[PDB]
Amino acid sequence: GSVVGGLGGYMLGSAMSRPLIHFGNDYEDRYYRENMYRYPNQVYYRPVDRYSNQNNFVHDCVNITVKQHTVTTTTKGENFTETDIKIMERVVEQMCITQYQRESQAYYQRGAS
């Protein structure tokens, strides 16, 4: 069960097995394998309907998603180091973009130009 009278503001994404995005290091690639089961495999968004634009939309979906975990690490004194956050900083954005690439259809049809 879940009981979060704030995060019901956002919806849960498409979902993905182990999202491992190739940062192109060895260390940033391994550090994931360790805490894999502790990282979020998803991100938080809405279906392009109260939340619109791309540039600042991604900056805000990225922020509000990751914030809702990094504020949660600063609850106890964040075991998630800077380099643990910076992994997720990218992953959150990619999975925001990857969700948003589904909702191309709805945007294209509901506007044009």
UniProtKB/Swiss-Prot annotation:
What's the effect of swapping residue 15 to V?
In scrapie; short incubation; sA allele
Record's GO cellular component, any one?
plasma membrane
Q: Which organism is it from?
A: Ovis aries (Sheep)
Report the family membership: Belongs to the prion family.
Q: Keyword Disulfide bond: yes or no?
A: yes
Q: Which gene encodes it?
A: PRNP
Q: Chief location of this protein?
A: membrane
Residues with an annotated glycan are: 63, 79
Give from-to of the shown chain within the full protein.
124 to 234 of 256
Q: What is this protein called?
A: Major prion protein
